[PDB]
């Protein structure tokens, strides 16, 4: 998250921290995700496509720090890793960038809701906030584009939704953005998602309800003029999600 503010998991208790274990045993952060039911996390396919083996991953819930345990957290293996059949990628753009992880602990259990671990609601179909609406993004991704390290503390920021028609303009992303994607940015381009924020939540308040509007997917740079963040538009994948949640 470029700019924004530090936070803790109470302020985004559906946020899932996804890591990958290496051959040799080191563990590294991959991507964010969101808890949509006790046994399911939703994320982005591009996070997993090069290493698509479920036994490679570890999922934490209730975690506010990247490399240190948070009191109350829970740790899960990945019982199933479901990537979208029609995934593709450009040089920049990722299509159908959505993934489901079914989570199960060493004891065989799913998430247990607590002050630090909650589900987030999915949107009603084809129902998105109007352009210019302020929504929030959360993650452990870089704080500057040139950084080498990820922040140790979770961050969040606010960005505003951009119309299809505006995001479509050559000097933005032209044809790269489809109707199954949502653009969002800061009016001064000063805050954004970045590397390592992928898979995480874009949350808007919809009919007085906090709703998973988007999933962090792609962008040219970060916090770059005329280059918004691009999000998978969750309201256009409800049959896919409904069906795969077994």
């Amino acid at each position: 998250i470029i700019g924004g503010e530090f936070t803790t998991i109470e302020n985004q208790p559906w946020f899932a921290a996804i890591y990958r274990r290496h051959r040799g045993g080191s563990v590294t952060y991959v991507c964010g995700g969101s808890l949509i039911s006790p046994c399911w996390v939703i994320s982005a396919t591009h996070c997993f496509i090069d290493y698509p083996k479920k036994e490679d991953y570890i999922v934490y819930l209730g975690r506010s720090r990247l490399n240190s345990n948070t009191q109350g957290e829970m740790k899960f293996e990945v019982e199933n890793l479901i990537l979208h059949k029609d995934y593709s990628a450009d040089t920049l753009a990722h299509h159908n960038d959505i993934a489901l992880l079914k989570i199960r602990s060493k004891e065989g259990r799913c998430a247990q809701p607590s002050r630090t671990i909650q589900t987030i609601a999915l949107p009603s179909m084809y129902n998105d906030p109007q352009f210019g609406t302020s929504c929030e993004i959360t993650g452990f991704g870089k704080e500057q584009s040139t950084d080498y390290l990820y922040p140790e503390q979770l961050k969040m920021t606010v960005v505003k939704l951009i119309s299809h028609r505006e995001c479509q303009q050559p000097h933005y992303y032209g044809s790269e953005v489809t109707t199954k994607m949502l653009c969002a940015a800061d009016p001064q381009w000063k805050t954004d998602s970045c590397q390592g924020d992928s898979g995480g939540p874009l949350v808007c308040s919809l009919q007085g309800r906090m709703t998973l509007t988007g999933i962090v997917s792609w962008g040219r740079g970060c916090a770059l003029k005329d280059k918004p963040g691009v999000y998978t538009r969750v309201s256009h994948f409800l049959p896919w999600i409904r069906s795969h949640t077994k």
Partner: peptide, 12 residues
Amino acid sequence: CSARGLENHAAC
């Protein structure tokens, strides 16, 4: 590789 869409990719 320095940005979003290539997280966890072998070529990065």
